[PDB]
Design a protein around this ligand. Sequence first.
Ligand SMILES: Nc1nc2c(ncn2[C@@H]2O[C@H](COP(=O)(O)OP(=O)(O)OP(O)(O)=S)[C@@H](O)[C@H]2O)c(=O)[nH]1
Ligand SMILES: [Mg+2]
Lengths: 24, 869, 860
Amino acid sequence: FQGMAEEVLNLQLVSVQVXXXXXX
Amino acid sequence: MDYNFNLEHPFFFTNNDYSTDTSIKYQASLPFNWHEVMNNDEWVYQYPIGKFVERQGWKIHISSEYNSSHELLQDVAKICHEMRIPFKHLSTEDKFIMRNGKLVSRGFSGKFITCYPNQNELESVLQRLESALKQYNGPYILSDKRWDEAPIYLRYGVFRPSRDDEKKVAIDELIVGDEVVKDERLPVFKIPKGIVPPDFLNKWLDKKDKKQGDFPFIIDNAIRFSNSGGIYNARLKEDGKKIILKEARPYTGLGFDGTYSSEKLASECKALKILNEWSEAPKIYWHGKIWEHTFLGIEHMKGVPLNRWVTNNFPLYEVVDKTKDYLLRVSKIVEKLIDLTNKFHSENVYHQDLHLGNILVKDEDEISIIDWEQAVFSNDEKVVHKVAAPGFRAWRETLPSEIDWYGIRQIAHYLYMPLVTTSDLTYNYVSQTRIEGKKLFESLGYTREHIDYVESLLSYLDSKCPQIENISRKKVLKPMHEIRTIESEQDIQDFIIKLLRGFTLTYGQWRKEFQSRFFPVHYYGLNFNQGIAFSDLAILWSYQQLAKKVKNFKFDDYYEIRTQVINEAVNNFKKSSLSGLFDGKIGTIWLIYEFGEIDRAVELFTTHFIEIFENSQNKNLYSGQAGILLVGLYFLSKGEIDNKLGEEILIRLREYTLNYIENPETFCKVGASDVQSNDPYENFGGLLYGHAGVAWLFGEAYKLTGESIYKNGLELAVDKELVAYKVDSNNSLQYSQGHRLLPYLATGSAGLLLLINRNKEILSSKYLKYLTSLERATDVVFCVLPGLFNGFCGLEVANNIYSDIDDNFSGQKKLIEQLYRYLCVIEEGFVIAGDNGLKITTDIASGFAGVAIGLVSIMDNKLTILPQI
Amino acid sequence: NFNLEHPFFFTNNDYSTDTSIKYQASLPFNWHEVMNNDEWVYQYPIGKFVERQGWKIHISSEYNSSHELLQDVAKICHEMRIPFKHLSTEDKFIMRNGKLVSRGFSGKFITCYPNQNELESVLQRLESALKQYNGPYILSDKRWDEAPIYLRYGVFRPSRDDEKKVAIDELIVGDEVVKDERLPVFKIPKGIVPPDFLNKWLDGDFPFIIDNAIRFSNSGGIYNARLKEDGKKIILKEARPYTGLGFDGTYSSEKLASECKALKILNEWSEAPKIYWHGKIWEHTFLGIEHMKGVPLNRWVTNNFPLYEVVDKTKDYLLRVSKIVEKLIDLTNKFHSENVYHQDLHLGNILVKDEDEISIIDWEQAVFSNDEKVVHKVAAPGFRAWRETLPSEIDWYGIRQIAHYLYMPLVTTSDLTYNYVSQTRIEGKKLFESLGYTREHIDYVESLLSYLDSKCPQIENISRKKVLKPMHEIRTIESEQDIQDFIIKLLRGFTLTYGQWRKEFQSRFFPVHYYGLNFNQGIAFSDLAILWSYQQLAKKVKNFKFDDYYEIRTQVINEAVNNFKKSSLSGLFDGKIGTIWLIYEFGEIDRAVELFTTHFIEIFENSQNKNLYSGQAGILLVGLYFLSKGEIDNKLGEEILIRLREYTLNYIENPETFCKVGASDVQSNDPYENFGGLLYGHAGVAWLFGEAYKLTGESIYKNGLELAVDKELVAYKVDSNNSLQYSQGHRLLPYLATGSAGLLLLINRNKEILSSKYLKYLTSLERATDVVFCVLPGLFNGFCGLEVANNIYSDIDDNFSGQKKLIEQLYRYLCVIEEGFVIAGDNGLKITTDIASGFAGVAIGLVSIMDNKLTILPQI
Ligand SMILES: Nc1nc2c(ncn2[C@@H]2O[C@H](COP(=O)(O)OP(=O)(O)OP(O)(O)=S)[C@@H](O)[C@H]2O)c(=O)[nH]1
Ligand SMILES: [Mg+2]
């Protein structure tokens, strides 16, 4: 897969769908 | 492990000053005519002596991998020491683990060396650094743009704080045009509002590669993002199918041992390749490598997790469950877990992470284990269990097969009695739940054979895990082995003596290695020191109020520590900047009065009451205006002040009542709320937060003088507060907050049940009909938190408090014999883990002081945390 | 007095940490645990009473078999009921079994606490599982049969209030007190009843005769003895089994064998000792080498360097130095062909015996391999290599700094600044050109030092000591602009060394030499005098940019007045009136007057001493200094004056009681152990008498001064250079504080009042403060005090020579930081900022050359 790049880079936005911090 | 919140450390919590030392540094070989500055304990900055640098400009970002991190310093500092380029880099290796790790945000990811070239010499810098490294590689670093084939990244940012010979510009703003522009940290690259690039950068910015677009994914949503990537919900483009998408950026997602996210992802892919014939295990539909992010798609299972299934099927009431039928489902689920664990242990795979978030229960009670991310495929070793959920971590090194059994044992013990949170503090804690779940299931009334079958299953699970010698500095904390039954007052005296002895032991371990405070405390109030809250003076007050109920205590060091606490409380009284009953300056005045100090309390009171009352902002009981008026009304009712000050207090209380009766919606929230949290300064519904605190003041004002406008305001406040309550299927009134119902003392149902029981003589027959509905909501058999504000002690101190009966033995017996499920021990001692057990704390909301005030208020029938009369 | 070591500054018994593998025996139920204080952990069974006194059980161990021994004690000790306590970390095990640690505490690894009724059973059970291990013998204890299982009468726990209260040091005695003392060789004290079994257990060819011992240590010490076959002259050695453990795993028995091998390889050489006897007596390794005569170079340099203007006639010093430095090179290049190395070549090993002939001794650190790069682990202060060199070049790195020490004796600060000796090599040529030696000798010794620079390789500097760099250029001072640049450089260096201290420490404000790290009030090691020196030197430079000190002024003043009465001290230099005087001269007038009026008559009667450092004389001196400004009222002024009226007559009644008359018997640069001088002792009484005469005019004050000067001048001794110097022990000390410069400045202050029979000493004291070289750069006992008392109270008003000499000769003590100049104190492994030895002393020195006052003493 070439010339893609931008695709994934963008992908990094979308939008989540609708305590206890520290990961798991 | 897993720091942040505040931190690690055995027993107590502590402040963010404990991450000290023990990792080797970087030490980039300073020449002469230069200098190195360690400023923020993270970065060392080197300035060429006698060179002017320019504000703003173009920064240079250099990334790295973990294996060849030490070579970039010797290949970049050698470049920068000739000529004149100032740079800064990381100091310790632990912050290099944390910067590229899992916990940090996507904005700060991969920054390892930052260079500061000037405007007119950036050409030679980039032309030398492109041919300099040429072989090393690292993560991409978001919010930046790449060079051609190097880890060099560019950004327009700020270099240094403002010069003396220039206009005063803050750190967060730039100087483009005549305007100041605040920058942002978004993961994508944006040119910050029309700053003109130089002529050579127009070719590097405005260029486009090949537009061959073939993406075999239709991304719909994204359930959660991380530093490694995100876990999307998409569909395949072959024909159909719902797929769960996983991704992992290269050279990131790093742990403390050298192992990246791609290795874990490949382990998941191999582990689901092996288990490719079971319906109760996910399957792989696609594995690939798009650009360099190595996407993985696995099938989507159905059902709800076991954590929600426990709260949906445990009997929390005596009437919520019909025709019994609960323990046999538990035995069936445990049998399925045993069968599954044996079947994939026979196939020589090991799942190694078994907690409540992986077992998914679908319809008709079928389980399906997911998240096979840390699987291993070899069992002849002894390793340390590294990554785990809170309360599911193995102890003191074991085989790679016994970690699964240690997980399954506590999943089975959680399904019998939902308290496994404090298992990271006390070894073999689940024996207490095994002992005391049988008493609960016998008291509810069940068949014997189900209990024997479940206990046989738990014995079989106990028989397949090894006993490990506890050497972890937490040896002193041991669970119970003998539980008695209270039949006389001497047992209550013995329990009180043991509880104060446990408080005496937990004082010394905090005072030996810390001096910033005097008692350990929950991490919400780690920086508060005043009020009826997370504090230290109320600890000694509750200690005195409980120790006066027992004859001839050992009386170790009481007067000395009383002297330093009562001196330190008044020594910094005006240095604080908060005013309120529970968190401000007027609370410690009442506590100083409660110790005694009749001259001192009046001398502070008449000096500071007017200044405290003028600068208040809010109008609630917890941190607003009603608590100061309640303290003033208490001081007027007992009587220690002059006539004109009391006249001013009554005039301003009448002003507050007249402002309340005109429009009540200004300083509360009449509604249902949509945010759910345990934060103190976020909830607006309850006795401490809202209309019930106003109604308490109105009841005290009616009891003091007797104006009918106080009764009208109290009735209006009660009729306004009952709007927020709802009725469940069991015909009970509960507070509503999001998707959760909160019957508790502070933020919920028990506060109104206490309030309308305190004013039964004043209220009429149209208001007392809710007592039967509210008493059915505070008659639960199990709740998670053991505290006073939002725990079991608050439920039991208010269920039978006033009652017009002096019968207090039954309430004490029930409280002590049912509160045994939350404790551990220390040496003829007793300490209570506080909300989110993974700690021991002494504070009034969830700890020693809360249960001490609970016993004192049950004995003396007063609820000695709100002043009255 | 608490020393520690880290980069840059000192700290006291904090910032040391503890990182090691912890010992951490297991724990069953019905027990507990409780770290008492940072070293021991105490396990005891709950619900069991213990006794006091009785018999303790110690158990010892070596390093590589300590964990198994702890596990093989804890298993038996968990059976039944015996409390026990053991060490916590390996660092405390290294410290307890070490070289320089005191011999009364040694080898306590497991301390066991049995009760009386079953002690025979626990000895019988413990002897079976043990005895396959071994350990040190340990003094003040007794071995049982064949084991490290040990016995000593001692207490278990402190006093319970139900029993009698007799504290820790007393052991069941009511009529008298019995305080136990831990000593070698070790007696059972008075009383004490061994019940039944201890009485049976408690109840030649020696080739050398020992005269006396020259050192005692935990390894055993070094003996001076003689043989039995002949008279002879031997230097004996000693060792102990499994004792002498460093931070790496090595014992004394390995080092003695390495010494024997390294001295038997070079047996044919006339500058190496000969082994007369090597053997083993029981387990203590005994070794005897011959007594090599001579003198170490630490006394040879001080006996042969040109120290005064004429001490070494007919030159010849550099010719003597050249022969020694070539003999060292040829000897070291000769014995390196036999693959033997020394790895420790400081001044205490090279001995000159026969007309500048060397003989290297003390071959305890021999290494016979030359292909692994190792870290220099043990060394003297100064001669430590940097960052993992080959073992061949460590000897050459030692010899290079030995030769640079022979050229000008300042090498002791080379452990802080890398390649410091370039400054010394630069300034030695200038000094020997000033003295006027031959050019060819200077060029020859320059060629030898260049050869030794060529032999030692160059190492990149990787540490946190990489900010401090040496000088490489020296500029001659010729005008006011050079001084105005040097002042700005010194202030910038003080700001940088304050900024480096403020980040990682908050208990104090400025770093202080370790004598006064505890003190926080007064003048000498204070916290407000440094900022006053900052302000006083910043006022002398034009339009200096203030960094933060408008805030720091009220910060330090408020912190000082908040803790003004939170101490128990009095005196001018380390007490409560010094901060009053310093607040008054700092700029705030009325607050100091109010505090003085409140507290002077309270402070006056509590003190006991009568000197200006801590006693009543400074109280009086500040008292009549405050009368000149006029803020004191009439009745309080009469109260101040009526005390001094009785004080002067009390001194006239008996002068010997107030101060010691003599020459003392101690050899230490200690504050409270010094007796004679302007600050410490008797000349300050004459200073107070000179001050008191100026406003009153009574001759009773003057006659006390002529008594005090004549009483002080009995201490000095005339040297062959015809100079009067202080004499304590056998050292001559011309200095400002405890020396001749204080008396010189005292006579120069009152030259118009005194008679002609006291002014004859001006030609004698000025020949003792004309010294060419002194080691320390401080004010009280350094070079700046010698250059401020030479020209301060002269009738002429030319001061440029006093600037030029003091600036030019104070360049070999400086380190550069970044356009800075931070000054190392005495025993310079430090950077210090205080008026005793540091930045503030040089600031007061420059001010007191410029302003004709010496502004750190109250004057009228
Ligand atoms: N109901 C349902 N949930 C799914 C499915 N696939 C994934 N999930 C969700 O994804 C979760 C996997 O864990 P995740 O949310 O990534 O955090 P984690 O992996 O447990 O821990 P962390 O390091 O990422 S913070 C599951 O607990 C589940 O909630 C599915 O098919 N059905
Ligand atoms: Mg995981």
